[PDB]
Amino acid sequence: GAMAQELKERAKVFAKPIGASYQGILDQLDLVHQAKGRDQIAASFELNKKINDYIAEHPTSGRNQALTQLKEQVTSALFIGKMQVAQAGIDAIAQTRPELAARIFMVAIEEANGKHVGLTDMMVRWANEDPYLAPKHGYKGETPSDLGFDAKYHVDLGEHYADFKQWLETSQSNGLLSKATLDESTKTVHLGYSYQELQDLTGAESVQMAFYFLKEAAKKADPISGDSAEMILLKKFADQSYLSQLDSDRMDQIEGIYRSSHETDIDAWDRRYSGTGYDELTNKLASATGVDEQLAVLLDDRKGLLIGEVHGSDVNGLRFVNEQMDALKKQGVTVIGLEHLRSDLAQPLIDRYLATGVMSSELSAMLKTKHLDVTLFENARANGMRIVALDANSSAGTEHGLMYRAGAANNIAVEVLQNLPDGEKFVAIYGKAHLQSHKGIEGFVPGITHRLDLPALKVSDSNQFTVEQDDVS
């Protein structure tokens, strides 16, 4: 009958029933109403995204222009006054990455107040050109709370589930990969390790095998793009909380790189370790014969030592520290720094060994991977010294990836080696890649040497120290 369907129709023209995607907008509004600080800003950006997503799927919906005005009101409230100066860049990122735009938005507020001018454009340029800041969906859905750890990935293995299960349980029976839980019902694995942390445990054949089937499983999920296995795991199987952690940390490092370029006194460094300062130091160091009085020159009002090693053999640093450890102890050295290990996981393992005297399996696997002598850790514990890991959690094809690592290594070196107890020196071992400063078109990052006010050193097979010159194009 013509009656009804018509009666049904204007029941809709008046009060249209709440759809599944309009409800998401109505719920997103409640977040804008209740949230404070940065969360409220991010919610507003997420609101605009859900509005823009709604209009695309539903062009003829009558809610469009009502939502369009709503988006206008929100956008105007956000970028009022001096905030419109960087509106274009931020709002462009907010179209795909609301939470990332919010972090930059907070910086833009401080820059509207005169603080750290130029940081906003730097963080925008990074978010547009650095692949690691590209839109990363990750895994969204049901996540277990039974885990005794914070899962970084939720990888669906599929056909490689059987082979992964074997090498995982083989590793867990050896005290490796403890933070990992399987689920055959979904054939997924709740992994608590990053791509970088697994790579430092590949010294054990059991882990490297499981690492293989993991990387292969990711390539099955996305063989159409040019993304590496590491990138796929982030875009497809990464935990949402972990992605927020990575984005937050990566924003902090850019801000760290920014402040390093203005506040680090390079003028004093070049006067002390370059030109005349380099000549005065080299000649005074050359006059010293034997190990002990050479260390006296190098630690003459200097917080520590920076010895460099390059790729291949080149391990005089690791050899000198192990053999002449008490010679360092005499000079006041109490800390030994290694760039060979990543701080986030290696440091609790090292501290537990230095305290109990028992080396865990996970630490033993790391030492095997990085070809580190266990005798070093034994002599360090016997001498009451502390070994610290100095590497960041970054990758080993853009320039931004190298600048991130160079800056993140600086922050680690600062929070560990810069402010030791008065009288305590240190001996850190870096590659010659970080003892130098990064001078690229896309930015500048001061080297470890600059932020720690120390020269770059090189020790020969005859235990003779020579001061390396700064690499400047």
Residue numbers in the entry: -4 to -1, 3596 to 3987, 3993 to 4069
Direct quotes from the study:
Deletion of N- and C-terminal flexible regions resulted in a core construct (residues 3596–4072) that produced crystals diffracting X-rays to 2.7 Å, with four VvRRSP molecules in the asymmetric unit (see under “Experimental procedures” for detailed information on structure determination and refinement). The structure of each of the four protein chains is essentially identical, except for the N-terminal α1 helix spanning residues 3596–3609. Size-exclusion chromatography revealed that VvRRSP exists as a monomer in solution; hence, the structure of chain A was considered representative of the subunit structure and was used in further analysis. The enzyme activity of VvRRSP (residues 3596–4072) was confirmed by in vitro KRas cleavage assay, demonstrating that the construct was functional and processed Ras and Rap1. The VvRRSP structure can be divided into an N-terminal lobe (N lobe, residues 3596–3722) and a C-terminal lobe (C lobe, residues 3740–4072), and the N lobe can be further subdivided into the membrane localization N1 domain (MLD), consisting of four helices (α1–α4), as characterized previously, and the N2 domain comprising three helices (α5-α7). The C lobe can also be separated into two subdomains, the C1 domain (α8–α12 and β1–β3), and the C2 domain (α13–α22 and β4–β11) that adopts a typical α + β TIKI fold. The structure of RRSP reveals that Asp-3721 on α7 forms a salt bridge with Arg-3841 on α12 that helps to maintain the structure between N2 and C1 domains. During refinement of the RRSP structure, we noticed that the electron density map around residues Arg-3988–Gln-3992 located close to the active site in the C2 domain is disordered, indicating flexibility and a potential involvement in substrate recognition. Although we did not observe any metal bound to VvRRSP during refinement of its structure, we biochemically examined whether it belongs to the TIKI metalloprotease family. Superimposition of VvRRSP molecules in the asymmetric unit reveals different conformations for the MLD fingers, indicating flexibility.
